[PDB]
Design a protein around this ligand. Sequence first.
Ligand code: JN3
Ligand code: JN3
Lengths: 184, 184
Amino acid sequence: DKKQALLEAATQAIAQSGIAASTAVIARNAGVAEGTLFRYFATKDELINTLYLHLKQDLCQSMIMELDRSITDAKMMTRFIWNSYISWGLNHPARHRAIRQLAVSEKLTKETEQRADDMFPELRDLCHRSVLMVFMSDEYRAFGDGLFLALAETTMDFAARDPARAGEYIALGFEAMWRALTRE
Amino acid sequence: DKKQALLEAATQAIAQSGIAASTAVIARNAGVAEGTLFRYFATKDELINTLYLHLKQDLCQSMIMELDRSITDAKMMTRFIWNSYISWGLNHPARHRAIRQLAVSEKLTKETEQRADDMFPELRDLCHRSVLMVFMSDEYRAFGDGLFLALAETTMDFAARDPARAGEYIALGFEAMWRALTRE
Ligand SMILES: C[C@H](CCC(=O)O)[C@H]1CC[C@H]2[C@@H]3[C@H](O)C[C@@H]4C[C@H](O)CC[C@]4(C)[C@H]3CC[C@]12C
Ligand SMILES: C[C@H](CCC(=O)O)[C@H]1CC[C@H]2[C@@H]3[C@H](O)C[C@@H]4C[C@H](O)CC[C@]4(C)[C@H]3CC[C@]12C
């Protein structure tokens, strides 16, 4: 209960304010004592990592349910994964806004990145993963994650504002993302 | 004086708040009466269009000064234009933030788009323009402008936060933009 309420309140606050959002704000919006928040997350760094994992789990659970694992072709599988990301963020704009800030925050621990993958094996190799961002040195993976998230946010913005052409924006954004972030 | 002060104050407000920013806020921050602001811009729509042109002039004046017109190769010329855009936005983050919101606002008049080009012929054909976004139907030009601006903002974000690798981010972002938004 209170853990879920705190994570939901942290999601809204960071979506609105960035990793800077105050624990006090988060605690009151969750209707708990700030000391109670520290019982769940002793530090802002811990809240960042725990919240990132929470949102990442939610997102990937969404992707798992839309995925058809017959599909082996990487581009097609990647299109489906994109479309599920755009859907997720249109359904949950604060989750997207929060995860975008978390993803590029530089407070994510190697432990946490590790923890993400271990929690959804299905994504590792029911796609055969990647071609996406393989060309980049390790140091620039964060930047490529930022580029992906930038493209996706724009695609969301336009689809939300002009729903009659949502599929068109999604398809154009996909093609942009894929050309940006792959090599043949 | 007062026109320039109002345009500067509108730039900060929209960068912070979006096309929604209030004229009252803009007028006080410019230290003029709100009725005085209406003498310069009778409507928020007019302020949007006049401000967009103001920022667009500033940006393109920057580009004109960095441009070497010996360069005929479109990709190289486009790289230079990108690098000058990234520089401009790092030098003037509110100008970038404001122009990004204006560019996609749907309040820009055909008259204004017309007015932009007429004001800088040098950009029309000392580059031979485009290859950029030529593939898109007219209805999606705004979306492609949004994609460009999304890529550029990210490239700025990373260059500002990690100046030691600024050129690297700029070059990677360029290549992403160019692959997204051209076809051979
Ligand atoms: C699951 C697929 C990999 C499969 C493929 O390339 O086909 C990942 C490839 C790019 C990732 C996304 C990309 O790295 C940007 C974000 C990074 C953030 O840490 C997680 C959410 C992200 C939005 C993330 C979610 C997982 C995908 C969408
Ligand atoms: C001047 C060059 C065209 C030349 C070329 O393709 O080599 C334009 C191609 C893309 C444009 C940019 C792109 O359309 C996105 C923004 C749109 C906004 O209305 C003006 C600023 C913009 C940031 C704009 C400024 C002019 C360039 C940078």
